[PDB]
Design an enzyme around this catalytic site. Structure first.
Site, PDB file in Angstrom:
ATOM      1  N   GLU A  56      -4.039   3.872 -11.002  1.00 35.90           N
ATOM      2  CA  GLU A  56      -4.677   2.755 -10.703  1.00 35.90           C
ATOM      3  C   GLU A  56      -5.846   2.556 -11.975  1.00 35.90           C
ATOM      4  O   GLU A  56      -6.255   1.708 -12.561  1.00 35.90           O
ATOM      5  CB  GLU A  56      -5.458   2.515  -9.357  1.00 35.90           C
ATOM      6  N   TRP A  62      -9.100   6.057  -1.174  1.00 35.83           N
ATOM      7  CA  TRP A  62      -9.463   7.052  -2.463  1.00 35.83           C
ATOM      8  C   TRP A  62      -8.486   6.503  -3.368  1.00 35.83           C
ATOM      9  O   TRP A  62      -7.374   5.738  -3.138  1.00 35.83           O
ATOM     10  CB  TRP A  62      -9.509   8.297  -2.191  1.00 35.83           C
ATOM     11  N   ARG A  73       0.010   4.575   2.832  1.00 32.15           N
ATOM     12  CA  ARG A  73      -0.154   4.242   4.220  1.00 32.15           C
ATOM     13  C   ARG A  73       0.199   5.748   5.188  1.00 32.15           C
ATOM     14  O   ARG A  73       0.307   5.545   6.233  1.00 32.15           O
ATOM     15  CB  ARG A  73       0.863   3.266   4.438  1.00 32.15           C
ATOM     16  N   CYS A  95       0.776  -1.142  -0.156  1.00 33.00           N
ATOM     17  CA  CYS A  95       0.140   0.053  -0.249  1.00 33.00           C
ATOM     18  C   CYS A  95       0.810   1.074   0.019  1.00 33.00           C
ATOM     19  O   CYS A  95       1.607   1.570   0.935  1.00 33.00           O
ATOM     20  CB  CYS A  95      -0.939   0.158   1.249  1.00 33.00           C
TER      21      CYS A  95
HETATM   22  C1  HEM Z   1      -6.415   6.256   1.210  1.00 32.46           C
HETATM   23  C2  HEM Z   1      -5.975   6.231   0.061  1.00 32.46           C
HETATM   24  C3  HEM Z   1      -5.394   4.911  -0.216  1.00 32.46           C
HETATM   25  C4  HEM Z   1      -4.349   4.868  -1.326  1.00 32.46           C
HETATM   26  C5  HEM Z   1      -4.223   6.053  -2.269  1.00 32.46           C
HETATM   27  C6  HEM Z   1      -4.145   3.411  -1.575  1.00 32.46           C
HETATM   28  C7  HEM Z   1      -3.393   2.793  -2.426  1.00 32.46           C
HETATM   29  C8  HEM Z   1      -2.974   1.772  -2.821  1.00 32.46           C
HETATM   30  C9  HEM Z   1      -2.554   1.288  -4.109  1.00 32.46           C
HETATM   31  C10 HEM Z   1      -1.987   2.259  -5.228  1.00 32.46           C
HETATM   32  C11 HEM Z   1      -2.342  -0.106  -3.947  1.00 32.46           C
HETATM   33  C12 HEM Z   1      -1.790  -1.160  -4.746  1.00 32.46           C
HETATM   34  C13 HEM Z   1      -0.967  -0.691  -6.002  1.00 32.46           C
HETATM   35  C14 HEM Z   1      -1.602  -0.497  -7.307  1.00 32.46           C
HETATM   36  O1  HEM Z   1      -2.930  -1.229  -7.435  1.00 32.46           O
HETATM   37  O2  HEM Z   1      -1.278   0.042  -8.227  1.00 32.46           O
HETATM   38  C15 HEM Z   1      -2.826  -0.335  -2.568  1.00 32.46           C
HETATM   39  C16 HEM Z   1      -2.775  -1.575  -2.010  1.00 32.46           C
HETATM   40  C17 HEM Z   1      -3.340  -2.058  -0.652  1.00 32.46           C
HETATM   41  N1  HEM Z   1      -4.102  -1.006  -0.024  1.00 32.46           N
HETATM   42 FE1  HEM Z   1      -3.942   1.025  -0.140  1.00 32.46          FE
HETATM   43  N2  HEM Z   1      -4.597   2.659  -0.479  1.00 32.46           N
HETATM   44  C18 HEM Z   1      -5.592   3.633   0.175  1.00 32.46           C
HETATM   45  C19 HEM Z   1      -6.090   3.052   1.293  1.00 32.46           C
HETATM   46  C20 HEM Z   1      -6.206   2.107   1.961  1.00 32.46           C
HETATM   47  C21 HEM Z   1      -6.857   1.532   3.379  1.00 32.46           C
HETATM   48  C22 HEM Z   1      -7.858   2.398   3.810  1.00 32.46           C
HETATM   49  C23 HEM Z   1      -6.464   0.225   3.475  1.00 32.46           C
HETATM   50  C24 HEM Z   1      -6.824  -0.730   4.506  1.00 32.46           C
HETATM   51  C25 HEM Z   1      -7.627  -0.429   5.418  1.00 32.46           C
HETATM   52  C26 HEM Z   1      -5.498  -0.151   2.404  1.00 32.46           C
HETATM   53  C27 HEM Z   1      -4.797  -1.356   2.417  1.00 32.46           C
HETATM   54  C28 HEM Z   1      -4.287  -1.780   1.188  1.00 32.46           C
HETATM   55  C29 HEM Z   1      -3.661  -3.289   1.187  1.00 32.46           C
HETATM   56  C30 HEM Z   1      -3.932  -4.489   2.119  1.00 32.46           C
HETATM   57  C31 HEM Z   1      -3.301  -3.236  -0.200  1.00 32.46           C
HETATM   58  C32 HEM Z   1      -2.576  -4.691  -0.732  1.00 32.46           C
HETATM   59  C33 HEM Z   1      -3.951  -5.099  -1.439  1.00 32.46           C
HETATM   60  C34 HEM Z   1      -3.939  -6.428  -2.417  1.00 32.46           C
HETATM   61  O3  HEM Z   1      -2.748  -6.922  -2.211  1.00 32.46           O
HETATM   62  O4  HEM Z   1      -4.917  -6.715  -3.162  1.00 32.46           O
HETATM   63  N3  HEM Z   1      -5.342   0.972   1.537  1.00 32.46           N
HETATM   64  N4  HEM Z   1      -3.334   0.714  -1.909  1.00 32.46           N
HETATM   65  C1  KMA Z   2      -8.325   0.784  -0.252  1.00 31.26           C
HETATM   66  C2  KMA Z   2      -7.674   0.829  -1.546  1.00 31.26           C
HETATM   67  C3  KMA Z   2      -7.420   2.096  -2.366  1.00 31.26           C
HETATM   68  C4  KMA Z   2      -6.855   2.135  -3.398  1.00 31.26           C
HETATM   69  N1  KMA Z   2      -6.621   3.196  -4.043  1.00 31.26           N
HETATM   70  N2  KMA Z   2      -6.238   0.910  -3.860  1.00 31.26           N
HETATM   71  C5  KMA Z   2      -6.444  -0.272  -3.314  1.00 31.26           C
HETATM   72  C6  KMA Z   2      -5.880  -1.451  -4.083  1.00 31.26           C
HETATM   73  C7  KMA Z   2      -6.841  -1.954  -5.096  1.00 31.26           C
HETATM   74  C8  KMA Z   2      -6.191  -2.898  -6.000  1.00 31.26           C
HETATM   75  C9  KMA Z   2      -5.153  -2.628  -6.851  1.00 31.26           C
HETATM   76  C10 KMA Z   2      -4.516  -3.962  -7.600  1.00 31.26           C
HETATM   77  F1  KMA Z   2      -3.312  -3.758  -8.281  1.00 31.26           F
HETATM   78  C11 KMA Z   2      -5.180  -4.938  -7.820  1.00 31.26           C
HETATM   79  C12 KMA Z   2      -6.390  -5.153  -7.171  1.00 31.26           C
HETATM   80  C13 KMA Z   2      -7.154  -6.491  -7.416  1.00 31.26           C
HETATM   81  C14 KMA Z   2      -6.891  -7.495  -6.338  1.00 31.26           C
HETATM   82  C15 KMA Z   2      -5.300  -7.978  -6.097  1.00 31.26           C
HETATM   83  C16 KMA Z   2      -4.791  -8.255  -7.476  1.00 31.26           C
HETATM   84  C17 KMA Z   2      -4.035  -9.603  -7.312  1.00 31.26           C
HETATM   85  C18 KMA Z   2      -3.742  -9.594  -5.634  1.00 31.26           C
HETATM   86  N3  KMA Z   2      -5.167  -8.852  -5.184  1.00 31.26           N
HETATM   87  C19 KMA Z   2      -6.767  -4.327  -6.418  1.00 31.26           C
HETATM   88  C20 KMA Z   2      -7.054  -0.523  -2.272  1.00 31.26           C
HETATM   89 CL    CL Z   3      -9.168  -1.033  -8.856  1.00 29.75          CL
END
Ligand code: HEM
Ligand code: KMA
Ligand code: CL
Ligand code: HEM
Ligand code: KMA
Ligand code: KMA
Ligand code: H4B
Ligand code: CL
Ligand code: GD
Ligand code: ZN
Ligand code: ZN
Ligand code: ZN
Lengths: 404, 402
Positions: free
Chosen positions: A285, A280, A111, A108
């Site tokens: 993304e 958000w 954070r 994430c």
């Molecule tokens: C508040 C604004 C937030 C932003 C901008 C954000 C951004 C991101 C991004 C960009 C990714 C994955 C990288 C990508 O997909 O390109 C991610 C993954 C993740 N985020 Fe955040 N996030 C936010 C809020 C949160 C919150 C509120 C939580 C938990 C309560 C959280 C927990 C996680 C987790 C666990 C992952 C890994 C998810 C996965 O492996 O599928 N995020 N986040």
């Molecule tokens: C809470 C939150 C905010 C934000 N801006 N982005 C996210 C991550 C969303 C997301 C980001 C991403 F790259 C992929 C997915 C699908 C589930 C993944 C794919 C394989 C492993 N699990 C979802 C979460």
């Molecule tokens: Cl998404």
């Protein structure tokens, strides 16, 4: 204690927090598997040591380690487990645990916000219609007319014997993906399976390429039931470009709320298989991953045709010019619609400050470089040149098997 | 129990059986992954020698034969007699290509079989070394139609010092500390520039002064050698539709030639074995010109482009960076100098991954270095899980000789 260097500034730090890492990852001295999306694969004596650790760091985080109700809460847990084989978290422990799970999430980039998280305690939920009501409140609170607020809803924990609460959708808001005669997809290809399921559990399939899927919600034991999201609750953003007039004619949209609903929250040995959380969006993304991935909407070439870009040759960098304009449109359209979004430069700069905070506060920060570096303009961001250590701390969000 | 590897763009699954043969240890443990870090006798010599001999004889479909066993016996004999051993010419050519094939951070490995190997193991002095290097640069540049090459100087031997090239690449621009505390030229070459000056080089005062070579023969101080200017092919940078760009005075050189890595083949170590290929355009456009700790031109280019640099949400960085890469590609094509853009290069690497799964059961690869520094997810390598591990023959990092 690994030495961690930033190659742009020259600064050096040592990650001491990683020594406290417990649950073991996928790499060995002989081969690194850091780039794998899903690492490896997915006597209540261990529960009690996991619970002690969580309690200890809860009281540490409020100065109160030593004497007083810290002493007292360790016995209450011992007594609770000796009498029931499990235990209940205090509301404040549950709030602290959900925040730490976010803070410990190595993938994430958002954070810096980990301290501002609204926690809805749905642990007394005992029904699927109850689930649906909790989720609608969540969506309402988190969406907030476009002034997005981070939030998580914690449904009841897994108890030994008897079923799990479970949201079958991967996110609260997903667009439908419809196969057809060619095996090509209209809508989101990432959602073909869940769309198939929704139809085979009752849903009337819809129009085209941006149909919000219904929710499949699973109360313990009783099978999943479909719930339709009211359209005024699902805030969406039509995509326009500030100077390319025809871009709006593409009819592209995206939803405002990213709400992951398929991960498992684990706190102090307890497991919450339904704990949907939302924040958000970062603009890449939507622009780069969801709209430009070849296995997603895959619009890059369509936008390139309209820009009159030279698609005859990769060395014109037409893919890169089209991608940048698609991210410009996303950022422009969310701002115009007054929906919270963050560009990847702002996000990564915030993550560097978070890395500095975490260094002072805990002695390190688990971070997964492949996921923290944005999918466009990677080296243009200050996280590219930052070495990072990846490891697993508890509390945590973990992947879990799908409920089928 | 071999790692399962998925391509998420297509759904491809394979298993890397080759990583089970990994011949050294990396920095990662089950506790913590350090994959993103930039920098991670006679009886072990014999087992490395035996393994390499085995590899060589498999490649010539002659494993277990009579020649094979004679070679294995001649090597352990010679290790007993002298503590070391000598490679045959064909073994050296095979090992040099294998070291390229095994390099996890190289995206250009589809080419690994087309490598010109120059045998300079007879080299005697720094003046001979200089002549060998100038023929390497001349051959490799080939008037802009670049050819991959390696020159191998004598192996490390007990009783003698190492041949060493002090320069990290054969062609580098000087970096000069300034009055402003700043750097004029390439900030990455400040240390080597100061060494050249203190070995007699009369410095320049430009941003693109080609550095001299500091060449060290065994048990000698390094000696300074100036590259003839007609040997170093450079490309002035212009933009196809941004005419003011040529007025920035930017240049880069044709030949990327790494000169400070150690080549290890069957336990033998070659501390001096400079190798060269041709540039991928993002190395020049994104890394060398846009990195803030390098020539750091990105804001000036954006300002000249009349981009709104007051806020990041305009994506002025991404836009300026793209046009700088466009100018690199257009300039090299105009100058008739080989260059490959990152779309073409990542696509050929995927074909290498496929060639290698069939031939060897896998391919060691360092995701964070294989994915280009701009537009990563627009390339096919982004969605390809990869397994990183160390095979030998290998190119290894080694400490600076000073
Ligand atoms: C508040 C604004 C937030 C932003 C901008 C954000 C951004 C991101 C991004 C960009 C990714 C994955 C990288 C990508 O997909 O390109 C991610 C993954 C993740 N985020 Fe955040 N996030 C936010 C809020 C949160 C919150 C509120 C939580 C938990 C309560 C959280 C927990 C996680 C987790 C666990 C992952 C890994 C998810 C996965 O492996 O599928 N995020 N986040
Ligand atoms: C809470 C939150 C905010 C934000 N801006 N982005 C996210 C991550 C969303 C997301 C980001 C991403 F790259 C992929 C997915 C699908 C589930 C993944 C794919 C394989 C492993 N699990 C979802 C979460
Ligand atoms: Cl998404
Ligand atoms: C022929 C065209 C070649 C291309 C296009 C190419 C491309 C690249 C790139 C792009 C990188 C690093 C990632 C980056 O800079 O973004 C790299 C690293 C590397 N290449 Fe290749 N290369 C080529 C030839 C060669 C040859 C001929 C050899 C050796 C015989 C070689 C060995 C290596 C090694 C060892 C590294 C890692 C260097 C380090 O870690 O410092 N390459 N190459
Ligand atoms: C892909 C990637 C990830 C990451 N964390 N860092 C990088 C930057 C790698 C790099 C790229 C580079 F060009 C130079 C360096 C430093 C080399 C040092 C300087 C003096 C002696 N040796 C490092 C790339
Ligand atoms: C042969 C060759 C061709 C080509 N196009 N590119 C290269 C790689 C050039 C390169 C790429 C790069 F990212 C960094 C360096 C400096 C030496 C590195 C820094 C940390 C470890 N060692 C050099 C080699
Ligand atoms: C193979 C690779 O691990 C996979 O494509 C990952 C790489 N890094 C990523 N990083 C982000 N932010 N989002 C992703 O979906 C991925 N996918
Ligand atoms: Cl370079
Ligand atoms: Gd122009
Ligand atoms: Zn690893
Ligand atoms: Zn993607
Ligand atoms: Zn860089």
């Amino acid at each position: 204690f690994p030495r961690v260097k930033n190659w742009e500034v020259g600064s050096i730090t040592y990650d001491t927090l990683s020594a406290q890492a417990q649950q073991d990852g996928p790499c060995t001295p002989r081969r690194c598997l850091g780039s794998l999306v899903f690492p490896r694969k997915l006597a209540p004596e261990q529960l009690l040591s996991q619970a002690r650790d969580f309690i200890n760091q809860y009281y540490s985080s409020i100065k109160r380690s030593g004497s007083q109700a810290h002493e007292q809460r360790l016995q209450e847990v011992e007594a609770e487990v000796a009498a029931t084989g499990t235990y209940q978290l205090r509301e404040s422990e549950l709030v602290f645990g959900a925040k730490q799970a976010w803070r410990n999430a190595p993938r994430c980039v958002g954070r810096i916000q980990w301290g501002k998280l609204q926690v809805f305690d749905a642990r007394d939920c005992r029904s699927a219609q109850e689930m649906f009501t909790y989720i609608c409140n969540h969506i309402k609170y988190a969406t907030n007319r476009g002034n997005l607020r981070s939030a998580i809803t914690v449904f009841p924990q897994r108890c030994p014997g008897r079923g799990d609460f479970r949201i079958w959708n991967s996110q609260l808001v997903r667009y439908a993906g419809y196969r057809q005669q060619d095996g090509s997809v209209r809508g989101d290809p990432a959602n073909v399976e869940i769309t198939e399921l929704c139809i085979q559990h009752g849903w009337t399939p819809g129009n085209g390429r941006f149909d919000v899927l219904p929710l499949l919600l699973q109360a313990p034991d009783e099978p999943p039931e479909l719930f339709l999201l009211p359209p005024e609750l699902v805030l969406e953003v039509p995509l326009e470009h500030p100077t390319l007039e025809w871009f709006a004619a593409l009819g592209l949209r995206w939803y405002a709320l990213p709400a992951v609903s398929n991960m498992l929250l684990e706190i102090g040995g307890l497991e919450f298989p339904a704990a949907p959380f939302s924040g958000w969006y970062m603009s890449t993304e939507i622009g780069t991953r969801n709209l430009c991935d070849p296995h997603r909407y895959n619009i890059l070439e369509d936008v390139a045709v309209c820009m009159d870009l030279d698609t005859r040759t990769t060395s014109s960098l037409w893919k890169d010019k089209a991608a940048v304009e698609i991210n410009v449109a996303v950022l422009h359209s969310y701002q115009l619609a007054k929906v919270t979004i963050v560009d990847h430069h702002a996000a990564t700069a915030s993550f560097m400050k978070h890395l500095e905070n975490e260094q002072k506060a805990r002695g390190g920060c688990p971070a997964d470089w492949a996921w923290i570096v944005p999918p466009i303009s990677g080296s243009l961001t200050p996280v590219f040149h930052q070495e990072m250590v990846n490891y697993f701390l508890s509390p945590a969000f973990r992947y879990q098997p799908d409920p089928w």
